Design a protein around this ligand. Sequence first.
Ligand SMILES: CC(C)(COP(=O)(O)OP(=O)(O)OC[C@H]1O[C@@H](n2cnc3c(N)ncnc32)[C@H](O)[C@@H]1OP(=O)(O)O)[C@@H](O)C(=O)NCCC(=O)NCCS
Ligand SMILES: CC(C)(COP(=O)(O)OP(=O)(O)OC[C@H]1O[C@@H](n2cnc3c(N)ncnc32)[C@H](O)[C@@H]1OP(=O)(O)O)[C@@H](O)C(=O)NCCC(=O)NCCS
Ligand SMILES: O=C1C[C@@H](c2ccc(O)c(O)c2)Oc2cc(O)cc(O)c21
Ligand SMILES: O=C1C[C@@H](c2ccc(O)c(O)c2)Oc2cc(O)cc(O)c21
Lengths: 382, 383
Amino acid sequence: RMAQRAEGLATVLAIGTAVPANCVYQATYPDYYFRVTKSEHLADLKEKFQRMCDKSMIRKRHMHLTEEILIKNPKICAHMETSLDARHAIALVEVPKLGQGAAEKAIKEWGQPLSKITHLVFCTTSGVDMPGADYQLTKLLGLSPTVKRLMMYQQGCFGGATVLRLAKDIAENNRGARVLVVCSEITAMAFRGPCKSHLDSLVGHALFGDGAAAAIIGADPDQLDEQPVFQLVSASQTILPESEGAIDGHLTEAGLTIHLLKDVPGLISENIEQALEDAFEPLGIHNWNSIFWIAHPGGPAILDRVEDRVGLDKKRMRASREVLSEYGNMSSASVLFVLDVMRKSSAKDGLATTGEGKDWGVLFGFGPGLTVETLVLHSVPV
Amino acid sequence: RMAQRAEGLATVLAIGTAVPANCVYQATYPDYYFRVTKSEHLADLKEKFQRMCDKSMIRKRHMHLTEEILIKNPKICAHMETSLDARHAIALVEVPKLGQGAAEKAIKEWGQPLSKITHLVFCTTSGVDMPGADYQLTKLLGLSPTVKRLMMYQQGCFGGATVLRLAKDIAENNRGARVLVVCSEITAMAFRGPCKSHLDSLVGHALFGDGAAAAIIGADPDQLDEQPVFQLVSASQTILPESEGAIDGHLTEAGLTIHLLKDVPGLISENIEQALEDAFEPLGIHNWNSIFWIAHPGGPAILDRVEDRVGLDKKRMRASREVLSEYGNMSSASVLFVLDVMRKSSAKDGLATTGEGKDWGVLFGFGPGLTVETLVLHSVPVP
Ligand SMILES: CC(C)(COP(=O)(O)OP(=O)(O)OC[C@H]1O[C@@H](n2cnc3c(N)ncnc32)[C@H](O)[C@@H]1OP(=O)(O)O)[C@@H](O)C(=O)NCCC(=O)NCCS
Ligand SMILES: CC(C)(COP(=O)(O)OP(=O)(O)OC[C@H]1O[C@@H](n2cnc3c(N)ncnc32)[C@H](O)[C@@H]1OP(=O)(O)O)[C@@H](O)C(=O)NCCC(=O)NCCS
Ligand SMILES: O=C1C[C@@H](c2ccc(O)c(O)c2)Oc2cc(O)cc(O)c21
Ligand SMILES: O=C1C[C@@H](c2ccc(O)c(O)c2)Oc2cc(O)cc(O)c21
């Protein structure tokens, strides 16, 4: 046992990302969306959608779904028609394929042979199948058949935090263990026509985009061969009081359907300081401007209300807001995009650490429950 | 870090199980199945199904699905009609509820307060939802809102092995950590009428039953308060060569569909010796009759072919075959039923350990990939 376990902290050794090539600009999206769903006669609905897109703080999203795919699948353009099989035909292929894109880039940065990967954690909100996307990606990359797999299906936007909590325990309990984590999301599971009865669906079509992110996680990194980017210090999870039904996601005959309440920004902002204190008081840290921030960019209102309630300088949420701006909400993938933006912008602006010159960092995932996942991170020098 | 980690091996401290009260005897099942699915005109198919049930070595299965629910959901009795929403309406409620049945029993055996549960791992092959069955069970039991949850959806028959591998890393890496693992399966997601084009579906309807199992796992058990049942020593996983497509499961508009190939018993039995060697060589163990066996009772053919290829005395597979006989194939839940049957029958037969008087044990999960999961277990003494 004592020799079978690793000594040091789980560490991010590499981060890769990938998006579908197809790029849709938010400025023109209300016109595109109402046109391709043949709903331009719903003028009030379109005006309401225009206001959502205008306040979204999203410049662009990447989307596998094109007009050509939508023309060949009219049932996906309707609001609530039988479409799961046509959606699965796309997503069961594209999720592992996008995850392969991200995984290759993480593996290239890491630079070790594929044989060294002992574990794979695959996380999606975008379809389910047996064998899983974990199997499909093992085959796509040529991992060892003895790779130990965890397939995290139907996770939602805290899935990015969940895979790091998982990778943490695996890497730290297994000497030599190197964990590939991959989060991959394709909105083709959820894309539908607008309807006046489901205004929360409209909000989802303003925010959700496609992407995948991959990291290599290991404890006791090699001095010459491996380059630490972040350390994973602790992982917590909580269900917020009075939050029942705030975020529901159903996999139906009509595909993936979302049920968002307007209260979500309020519920998270009202509970975030208790989450900070439970994570940081044991480390004697109390100044929320003295830590770097990896906040799941769920939407501008979440970031705004957390920033306001906690008292953050605008710089703290910059990396989260860049991911929201450049990619939208990519569910489980987003927080790894934020981590990657933060370490790259920190090096480019010649700061002292991978976390904007600070030592300690917080990573937040938010999703159904309502669930808040809190990870304490530690930066490494540049 | 050296402070936040536990010292000893992840240990099973309690096991509870639960099944739907509705009990379907296999002897009469061909008549029930062909009748409730209004398929009595398919005489050849029914004769083939009669032979499958007769060779199944299953005496009974528990099924949430009753005739009354089938009459109110005709689309589920068809082979391949749009039915996912009706299936989900049953399974998204009954999976957590059956898991709560098993979890309550494990928690009663354990005897510690619910507040001591730090982590929950929920596994199913029976429907998906957000929030998950993990959330629903947290609510049903009244676990702490700070419980750290892993929701293992669409896992298949190796899920029972997977949750123990997960609990092992969590319990050993987190001082004080007590992990509730729950596997819960409801065949309402998969139940359908027979079709001459899908004979593997027929095999499923002969073997799969409903059930849930729960265990409490922790490292460094408390000397006065907690009594170990098994230790989790190692966990391995492999994709068998030349096995692509052997076991597929699709969640469709028509519910969960299975795609089994006849080679499955062959593929597993041909690779099991290498899996035993990879797990036990490092411990210097070579005699497969000197260890206790927790084999996923996927079907009589898998147990028969492994027993023959490995050279096992009939005694080794007794606990696996009892679970098959008394419950059928309960997917991810089955191996925990087998662990529970082994420790209970070992105490009843006044044997020296929880593993039929042996010290070392092997637990196998099998499922899509084709994936074989191999855990080394260690028994504990029995007074
Ligand atoms: C939608 C959003 C991007 C812009 O809205 P905003 O900054 O609050 O500005 P407004 O109040 O002008 O809202 C614009 C429109 O969206 C509507 N809206 C916002 N959230 C909504 C919700 N959950 N359900 C329904 N409508 C909603 C408003 O009613 C308004 O419609 P109207 O102008 O026709 O009355 C912002 O509300 C947001 O960040 N919310 C989503 C956060 C969230 O729930 N994330 C989920 C992660 S799973
Ligand atoms: C189903 C089972 C109980 C039948 O008993 P058996 O000893 O194989 O007996 P038989 O070979 O006579 O099988 C009975 C019938 O089932 C058919 N059958 C068996 N496996 C089949 C499969 N995978 N697909 C289609 N038909 C199958 C046989 O061809 C035969 O049809 P017939 O009687 O008209 O000739 C047995 O095959 C079994 O245990 N299967 C292994 C379990 C499995 O593959 N899945 C595990 C769950 S993941
Ligand atoms: O309902 C959903 C949609 C889902 C999603 C799917 C595919 C994507 O590419 C994507 O960006 C998002 O995201 C969700 C995330 C949640 O936290 C809750 C949900 O209900 C949903
Ligand atoms: O397709 C399936 C069915 C599934 C199952 C669901 C619900 C139950 O109660 C149950 O006992 C089984 O079991 C499977 C197990 C597998 O390993 C693969 C599958 O495709 C399936």
